[PDB]
Design an enzyme around this catalytic site. Structure first.
Site, PDB file in Angstrom:
ATOM      1  N   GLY A   1      77.540  32.592 -14.557  1.00 57.93           N
ATOM      2  CA  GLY A   1      76.966  33.252 -15.736  1.00 57.93           C
ATOM      3  C   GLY A   1      76.530  34.648 -15.413  1.00 57.93           C
ATOM      4  N   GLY A   2      76.302  35.409 -16.469  1.00 59.52           N
ATOM      5  CA  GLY A   2      75.719  36.743 -16.263  1.00 59.52           C
ATOM      6  C   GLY A   2      74.254  36.714 -15.899  1.00 59.52           C
ATOM      7  CB  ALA A   3      71.881  39.489 -15.336  1.00 58.16           C
ATOM      8  NE  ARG A   4      65.196  35.099 -17.784  1.00 58.01           N
ATOM      9  CZ  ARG A   4      63.927  35.439 -18.066  1.00 58.01           C
ATOM     10  NH1 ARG A   4      63.509  36.687 -17.938  1.00 58.01           N
ATOM     11  NH2 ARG A   4      63.082  34.530 -18.512  1.00 58.01           N
TER      12      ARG A   4
ATOM     13  CB  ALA B   1      65.739  30.241  -1.177  1.00 59.83           C
TER      14      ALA B   1
ATOM     15  CB  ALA C   1      66.341  35.825  -3.351  1.00 57.61           C
TER      16      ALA C   1
ATOM     17  CG  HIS D   1      64.666  31.009 -10.638  1.00 57.18           C
ATOM     18  ND1 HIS D   1      65.553  31.824  -9.970  1.00 57.18           N
ATOM     19  CD2 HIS D   1      64.946  31.154 -11.940  1.00 57.18           C
ATOM     20  CE1 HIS D   1      66.338  32.433 -10.848  1.00 57.18           C
ATOM     21  NE2 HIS D   1      65.972  32.052 -12.054  1.00 57.18           N
TER      22      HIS D   1
END
Lengths: 174, 174, 174
Positions: free
Chosen positions: B11-14, B36, B38, B52
């Site tokens: 999916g795209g962002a947000r 994780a 990030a 999240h």
């Protein structure tokens, strides 16, 4: 598979749309012609031509006229990139509306079958400059006009092809 | 629901892709592990990790090796972002092709089930710089290779999930 | 066609989403109201208003309040752009979370039917600036909340509309 004259394949960058078109064309049993729109000005672009690398025909600018005079019942023409053709016209300073509408009309009357490979460029943020905004608009319009003209339209996402035309479009009463 | 080993959520962002994966995992009844990727270098990134926010395992760089040694029949691993892992490799100066192909092979042989959450980044305009162009290309390729490797693929648009694999892909005769 | 109260139409730039909404509204037989969010600050924007050009109501900032007081059983309201409304709020320095959640709640209780036309902006690369990143996030969230609130959701790609709501969402066991 379903017999058609014209297919539009739309996808993002590195979506697999070119592999989908190339393996459909190779499976077809027709005489294959790549209509190559990419100007190999640098090695990054020659690199992408080499990676994709059939009769090869260059059509950097005169895409529609090239389709009309190369199309034959026994041939399948694959347009390697509608997007790079539009880019070529834009950068030169050409008005993009007439060639787009000319190409959709061409897509409707060829002497033989054609697959158009085109990018979706419209699902990010508004470009910070008028050239990129114009290009984004023209590519969106072009894909609409080609989807209207073509027998079939497939969206390729993450290398997976989904048919969206033919297909009944939704209707709502209010 | 349909029993599988491997799901790719794109999916795209947000777009809601993370909520779709998290609520599928929470509904599963398996032991949950967030993988994780990030690097919480700044508060914007810690903010998105906090929003999240299960066993939490950091895998900023060694994603595939982490999957192989954390996967268990009784566990479901969720990769919080394929995209942020690729970003980490790119920024460092790593070549992205081998780790991508290594990850697809890993996605094919885990000792337990996995959901990969990944962005579509390819449906905007061409980036004005080579780092962003490389990243866009590598993420597109990566999603293709993961879609080929995984049992199932869902596209999430505006919080709504559409299954695109399994599904018969279209065939055309010319 | 299917009788509903609320439709969300999502598409990229120059995707045909506005033509899809306008021809659905014109086919409906209801009294048509364009809820116009675009601030005609320059000729490029007046140009896009002119191209799309029904009762016309300007709602540059107070979109939800305008919907509540313009909606009638006999009327169909079309929101010309959710995206340009969010842009207006962002540029001013407004917090975007409350108006987004206020609009989704509004979308759930109107006295008459509404079509929301909104862009996908999330499927390109990460913006190089915080304003564009915030906008991308807020638009993604907004489309999720409107898709949850609305009876029906259509994605428009290359001028072709695909219904994604109503529709059963996929379930996986692991």
């Amino acid at each position: 598979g379903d017999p058609i004259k014209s297919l539009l394949v739309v996808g993002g960058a590195r979506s697999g749309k070119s592999r989908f078109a190339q393996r459909m064309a190779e499976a077809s049993g027709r005489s294959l012609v790549l209509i190559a729109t990419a100007q190999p000005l640098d090695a990054e672009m020659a690199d992408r031509i080499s990676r994709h690398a059939w009769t090869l025909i260059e059509a950097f600018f005169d895409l529609g006229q090239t389709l009309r005079r190369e199309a034959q019942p026994e041939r399948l023409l694959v347009v390697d990139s509608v997007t790079l053709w539009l880019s070529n016209l834009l950068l030169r300073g050409d008005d993009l509306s007439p060639p787009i509408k000319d190409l959709a009309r061409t897509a409707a009357r060829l002497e033989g079958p054609v697959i158009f490979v085109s990018n979706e460029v419209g699902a990010g943020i508004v470009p910070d400059n008028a050239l990129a905004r114009a290009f984004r608009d023209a590519q969106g319009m072009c894909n609409q006009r080609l989807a209207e003209a073509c027998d079939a339209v497939t969206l390729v996402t993450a290398g997976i092809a989904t048919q969206i035309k033919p297909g009944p479009e939704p209707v709502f009463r209010f």
